[PDB]
Design an enzyme around this catalytic site. Structure first.
Site, PDB file in Angstrom:
ATOM      1  N   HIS A 148       0.814  -1.255   0.000  1.00 22.18           N
ATOM      2  CA  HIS A 148       0.000   0.000   0.000  1.00 22.18           C
ATOM      3  C   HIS A 148       0.819   1.263   0.000  1.00 22.18           C
ATOM      4  O   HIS A 148       0.268   2.389  -0.057  1.00 22.18           O
ATOM      5  CB  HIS A 148      -1.034   0.051   1.121  1.00 22.18           C
ATOM      6  CG  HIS A 148      -0.472   0.123   2.503  1.00 22.18           C
ATOM      7  ND1 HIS A 148      -0.133  -1.010   3.239  1.00 22.18           N
ATOM      8  CD2 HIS A 148      -0.227   1.179   3.301  1.00 22.18           C
ATOM      9  CE1 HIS A 148       0.333  -0.645   4.415  1.00 22.18           C
ATOM     10  NE2 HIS A 148       0.248   0.683   4.495  1.00 22.18           N
ATOM     11  N   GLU A 173       0.595  -8.426   0.374  1.00 26.14           N
ATOM     12  CA  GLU A 173       0.857  -7.068   0.885  1.00 26.14           C
ATOM     13  C   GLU A 173       2.328  -6.687   0.848  1.00 26.14           C
ATOM     14  O   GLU A 173       2.760  -5.729   1.492  1.00 26.14           O
ATOM     15  CB  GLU A 173       0.289  -6.891   2.272  1.00 26.14           C
ATOM     16  CG  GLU A 173       0.244  -5.440   2.730  1.00 26.14           C
ATOM     17  CD  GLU A 173      -0.550  -4.562   1.795  1.00 26.14           C
ATOM     18  OE1 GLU A 173      -1.550  -5.055   1.204  1.00 26.14           O
ATOM     19  OE2 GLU A 173      -0.192  -3.357   1.674  1.00 26.14           O
ATOM     20  N   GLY A 198       2.248   5.242  10.319  1.00 23.90           N
ATOM     21  CA  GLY A 198       3.582   5.744  10.059  1.00 23.90           C
ATOM     22  C   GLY A 198       4.620   4.662  10.331  1.00 23.90           C
ATOM     23  O   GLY A 198       5.795   4.898  10.145  1.00 23.90           O
ATOM     24  N   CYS A 217       4.413   1.457   9.090  1.00 23.60           N
ATOM     25  CA  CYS A 217       4.404   0.427   8.079  1.00 23.60           C
ATOM     26  C   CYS A 217       5.725   0.339   7.367  1.00 23.60           C
ATOM     27  O   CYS A 217       6.403   1.335   7.104  1.00 23.60           O
ATOM     28  CB  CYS A 217       3.266   0.594   7.085  1.00 23.60           C
ATOM     29  SG  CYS A 217       1.731   0.269   7.918  1.00 23.60           S
TER      30      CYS A 217
HETATM   31  C1  LIG Z   1       0.789   1.712   7.656  1.00 21.34           C
HETATM   32  O1  LIG Z   1       0.425   1.577   6.402  1.00 21.34           O
HETATM   33  C2  LIG Z   1      -0.547   1.682   8.468  1.00 21.34           C
HETATM   34  C3  LIG Z   1      -0.400   1.392   9.991  1.00 21.34           C
HETATM   35  C4  LIG Z   1      -1.623   1.065  10.888  1.00 21.34           C
HETATM   36  C5  LIG Z   1      -2.500   2.243  11.323  1.00 21.34           C
HETATM   37  C6  LIG Z   1      -2.921   2.018  12.792  1.00 21.34           C
HETATM   38  N1  LIG Z   1      -2.115   0.859  13.124  1.00 21.34           N
HETATM   39  C7  LIG Z   1      -1.223   0.573  12.265  1.00 21.34           C
HETATM   40  O2  LIG Z   1      -0.059   0.012  12.625  1.00 21.34           O
HETATM   41  N2  LIG Z   1      -1.336   0.560   7.959  1.00 21.34           N
HETATM   42  C8  LIG Z   1      -2.453   0.837   7.455  1.00 21.34           C
HETATM   43  O3  LIG Z   1      -2.819   1.990   7.435  1.00 21.34           O
HETATM   44  C9  LIG Z   1      -3.331  -0.262   6.965  1.00 21.34           C
HETATM   45  C10 LIG Z   1      -3.708   0.106   5.519  1.00 21.34           C
HETATM   46  C11 LIG Z   1      -3.787  -1.028   4.495  1.00 21.34           C
HETATM   47  C12 LIG Z   1      -3.475  -2.381   4.757  1.00 21.34           C
HETATM   48  C13 LIG Z   1      -3.601  -3.360   3.773  1.00 21.34           C
HETATM   49  C14 LIG Z   1      -4.029  -3.003   2.497  1.00 21.34           C
HETATM   50  C15 LIG Z   1      -4.335  -1.666   2.212  1.00 21.34           C
HETATM   51  C16 LIG Z   1      -4.213  -0.688   3.208  1.00 21.34           C
HETATM   52  N3  LIG Z   1      -4.429  -0.352   7.971  1.00 21.34           N
HETATM   53  C17 LIG Z   1      -5.483   0.451   8.175  1.00 21.34           C
HETATM   54  O4  LIG Z   1      -5.720   1.443   7.498  1.00 21.34           O
HETATM   55  O5  LIG Z   1      -6.378   0.102   9.291  1.00 21.34           O
HETATM   56  C18 LIG Z   1      -7.787   0.046   9.020  1.00 21.34           C
HETATM   57  C19 LIG Z   1      -8.489  -0.666  10.183  1.00 21.34           C
HETATM   58  C20 LIG Z   1      -8.345   1.456   8.796  1.00 21.34           C
END
Ligand SMILES: *[C@@H](O)[C@H](C[C@@H]1CCNC1=O)NC(=O)[C@H](Cc1ccccc1)NC(=O)OC(C)C
Length: 181
Positions: free
Chosen positions: A41, A72, A146, A148
């Site tokens: 992503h 992913e 932040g 990821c």
């Molecule tokens: C880094 O990309 C981010 C970190 C998350 C945010 C809160 N906890 C974390 O460690 N991850 C994400 O934002 C993912 C997005 C994603 C994952 C797979 C495919 C496409 C996008 N998670 C995310 O947005 O959480 C949802 C429950 C809203």
């Protein structure tokens, strides 16, 4: 210095880089040669900003399993002068759990950051941001946006790449050595 601290710091120096794409700040793991891996992503384009300069991406491969399901991870090949220290030997042959793992993060906003995520356990299927995802593992730690790309490490092994969380738990895409053959 002790051995675990030495290994994580050496990772940070040699393999774990600060990057930015259109989607924002990520940690990138350089695996060998001009091959690195990022969370899918992150959506790297033709060029990616690495630390202090814009680097051309020669190829990107978004990894899927046999069932066609998202892993992913995106493997990128860089147009760089020189080769990453080869750390494939530290990646297990199959996706592996661990105890007392550490998540190593390196971003402009979160430079050289160590997060003690604890035990990392098999999780499998995950639906994150609407996309169904296989081969994930889980740690009971409230990881943040932040983070990821962050590299999940334990006992001299590199086992995952952080891909998300749910405010109480964090998840990584598991790593196996054969992704990088
Ligand atoms: C880094 O990309 C981010 C970190 C998350 C945010 C809160 N906890 C974390 O460690 N991850 C994400 O934002 C993912 C997005 C994603 C994952 C797979 C495919 C496409 C996008 N998670 C995310 O947005 O959480 C949802 C429950 C809203």
């Amino acid at each position: 210095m002790g051995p675990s601290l030495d290994f994580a710091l050496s990772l940070l120096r040699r393999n774990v880089r600060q990057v930015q794409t259109d989607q924002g700040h990520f940690t990138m793991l350089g695996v060998r040669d001009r091959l690195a891996v990022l969370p899918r992503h992150s959506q790297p384009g033709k060029t990616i900003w690495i630390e202090h300069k814009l680097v051309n991406i020669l190829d990107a491969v978004e990894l899927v399993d046999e069932q066609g399901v998202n892993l992913e991870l995106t493997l990128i090949t860089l147009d760089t002068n020189e080769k990453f220290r080869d750390i494939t030997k530290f990646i297990p042959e199959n996706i592996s759990t661990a105890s007392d793992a550490t998540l190593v993060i390196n971003t402009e906003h979160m430079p050289s950051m160590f997060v003690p995520v604890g035990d990392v356990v098999q999780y499998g299927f995950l639906n994150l941001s609407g996309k169904p995802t296989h081969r994930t593992m889980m740690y009971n730690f409230p990881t943040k946006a932040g983070q990821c790309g962050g590299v999940v490490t334990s006992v001299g092994k590199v086992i995952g790449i952080h891909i998300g969380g749910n405010g109480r738990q964090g998840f990584c895409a598991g790593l196996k050595r054969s992704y990088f053959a």
